[PDB]
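User: For a benchmark we're assembling, each entry needs the component sequences followed by a predicted structure for the full assembly. Here are entry 17's components. Please fill in the structure.
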Amino acid sequence: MIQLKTMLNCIDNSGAALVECAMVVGQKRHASIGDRIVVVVQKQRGTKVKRGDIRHAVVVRTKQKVQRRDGSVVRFDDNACVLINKAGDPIGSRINGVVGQELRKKKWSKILSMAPMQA
Amino acid sequence: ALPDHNFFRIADKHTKKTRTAFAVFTPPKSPTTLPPSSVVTKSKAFKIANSKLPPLMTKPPSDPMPLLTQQQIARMDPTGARTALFSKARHAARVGDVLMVTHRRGGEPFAGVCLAIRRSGIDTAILLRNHLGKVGVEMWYKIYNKNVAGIEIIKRRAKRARRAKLMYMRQPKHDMGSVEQYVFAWKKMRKVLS
Amino acid sequence: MKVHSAIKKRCEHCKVVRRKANKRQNGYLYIICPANPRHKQRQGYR
Amino acid sequence: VKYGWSTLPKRSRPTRFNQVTQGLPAPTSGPAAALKRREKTTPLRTGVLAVKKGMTVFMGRTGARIPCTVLQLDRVQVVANKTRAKNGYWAVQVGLGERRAENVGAPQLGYYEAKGIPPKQTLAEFKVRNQDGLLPVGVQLFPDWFHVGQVVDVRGITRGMGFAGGMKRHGFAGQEASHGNSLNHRTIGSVGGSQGSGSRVLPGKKMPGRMGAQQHTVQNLPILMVDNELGIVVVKGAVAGHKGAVVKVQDAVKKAPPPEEFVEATKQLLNERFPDAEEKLQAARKLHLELKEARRQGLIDSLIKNG
RNA sequence: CAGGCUAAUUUGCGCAAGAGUGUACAAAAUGAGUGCGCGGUUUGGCACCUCGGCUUGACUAAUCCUCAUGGAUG
RNA sequence: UCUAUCUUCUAGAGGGAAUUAGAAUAUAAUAAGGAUUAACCUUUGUACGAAAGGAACAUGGGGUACUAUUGU
RNA sequence: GUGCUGAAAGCAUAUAGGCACGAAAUUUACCUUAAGAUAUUUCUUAAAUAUACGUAAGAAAAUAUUACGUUAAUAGGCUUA
Ligand SMILES: [K+]
Ligand SMILES: [Mg+2]
Ligand SMILES: [Mg+2]
Ligand SMILES: [Mg+2]
Ligand SMILES: [Mg+2]
Ligand SMILES: [Mg+2]
Ligand SMILES: [Mg+2]
Ligand SMILES: [Mg+2]
Ligand SMILES: [Mg+2]
Ligand SMILES: [Mg+2]
Ligand SMILES: [Mg+2]
Ligand SMILES: [Mg+2]
Ligand SMILES: [Mg+2]
Ligand SMILES: [Mg+2]
Ligand SMILES: [Mg+2]
Ligand SMILES: [Mg+2]
Ligand SMILES: [Mg+2]
Ligand SMILES: [Zn+2]
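Assistant: Structure for entry 17:
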């Protein structure tokens, strides 16, 4: 459950390390795995995104428990995302870390193909 | 034709006289189990659920929930191997052990240390924790769901845990970390054995 | 259609008619033209 | 006017004198008109009375996990039928359970006496579309009355909540908690406008009050399991009320009726399981007149000691 | 301050007429300075009469979105 | 600052007059309210168009249960 | 808003007369509450019935509502799972 002012760990090679959620796009309820958000970059890593940039992102794993049809429930130790463009495709080229398997049913194929492991 | 019945009497207490009486009808004392039915339908859209008809006008079991639970468990686990894997016995899987859950229609079994066993009939579940990379991941799994193709014990706990739930393993002090070590050793012992 | 309080013919093919009059409403005065559909006008509001 | 546009007194009965056969227009109001504007939504078959026994999940053989509610049928019988000629609408009166005769009143003891049916615990009417939905009196309805996949509507009484405030009863947001608020954290705030709005609280104003214990219907619930031995009908989703409360199950009104082959197959099973429904009913009716006449004369005690 | 009367004014509108703009062509769009009115939102006159936010509404329709639709050398 | 007397209001009751001797149970006509959003895909890259671009009508998107439908 | 027929008015016209298409508004439908005609081959000649009392509860500020009271599983205890 991501909302305004929530901090997330960006796990793509876009240049961002810590981003703050500014808007939940396409809905009023708090964002979960597979939802689009607008973020503001607060920390970088050392056409990369710099601190203060405003980009769109996709929640790839949350700390709130996410239930599935088969009764299984997944939970991560952090909230993470990957930056995207208004077109919907990723900005980076490689993702380091596990992502939520809920990205499959929300039409995020490109984010999954570059994801090493899914949970 | 007239079904069996008994007479209920209302008496006047100021005169000890019968005010009015009625013939109260009782259900057939001997429950009659009729023969099988001859009604047969030919359609792909519906079926008639007349498999086992009970005796006519008989109170069904008061609490059908425990009876319905054993029907689903016997259906989701015919051999009874999963029900025995998590029973409250010595050979069964205990909290604190390491379990590997194989997924139907999936790859990359999820392995982790068991932190809790919720016994809720057909919704019995186990919580497994692991570290995929540098991120902790906990997972609930309904053992009787068919998406759980298999469950194996790859590493048992030396001493029986002193707690029904081990939620303290979320703390870095008691966090076991990753489990790829026990998974590898388990697979090694498996192929070398056969 | 142009709704005016002063409807006028703008060519020799424009005609004044009263349509949508029935047992419930009085209707409106219309300027109908088969030549130019830009001459279509209505007098009165619903 | 007390109700609606009609000023007619409440003791006048002019209906039979305004007939369509006399060349008059068919009224848009009345029983005949009411039924006509509900013909598409009125179920063809009757329903059943069931007891809510608890919630669970239905596990599929390939991975499905569907929440569901278990409803048990406890000696469901057809007690009476309603006709337009006698009542102004088609309906079947269905019973549930049993009850001690001492707890049943003399008016109801004679009501079941004339039908050959043991005293029931609860009665309820289920409206049918036409005369084809009426069933023989004294036949038992089993879970097989429905088939797996059949969509039904479930009516029950919701859990009572007693006197509820404005937050729980109407979803009012409340007021602030710390920034100076004084004794008004869960209060309803303003109850209306000033003189220019009537100098009164308007009718329909949402205020605290009793909540719950009202009838509630859930529509379009599929049936996942049907077991006659246990007498249960497992429906998907949630149902109003507590465990052990009686609910009404009937075919959905917003869905097409079940196939004609199924409606006839079920009516054909009643005749096989109860081929003597009519012979045993007329026999009970005959006895009622004999006992009714004995009570009138005062010789009922004789008819009791003879057997 | 509010209410009442009034409507000069208004960051409120309508109708009539049509200089003109619209490569052409008044009225697709546009509409100088004006006239005839509605309305009671602003600033005022008279002297009958001595704020914003939160919560919770009700109502109007001169409509930002959603529904049906005429016109549109343009 | 104010412990609500009255009207209005939200709930729940005591009594009552009903075609009328009075009840038990199930109830109709009828009345008062409630529910009331938008977008995407499919159609289809079809009509239109030099191209870019891109509708309308209609069907489906309740199922890892039934059923329906699409693949293998 | 869009038509068919068609005159007054030889034409024209969806103008009169005779037919029709057409919207998140309306009505119905759907849901709740109220209403309480009516129904039962229902009960009652001082009752039927209801209340009180007691054990309660799908009910719950009081009240009310829905059950049960030994021919009884209403509550508590005990026993087993
Ligand atoms: K009688
Ligand atoms: Mg309760
Ligand atoms: Mg709050
Ligand atoms: Mg305080
Ligand atoms: Mg007044
Ligand atoms: Mg003065
Ligand atoms: Mg056009
Ligand atoms: Mg008072
Ligand atoms: Mg007042
Ligand atoms: Mg009604
Ligand atoms: Mg399938
Ligand atoms: Mg028109
Ligand atoms: Mg003509
Ligand atoms: Mg014509
Ligand atoms: Mg309803
Ligand atoms: Mg109390
Ligand atoms: Mg007990
Ligand atoms: Zn013209």
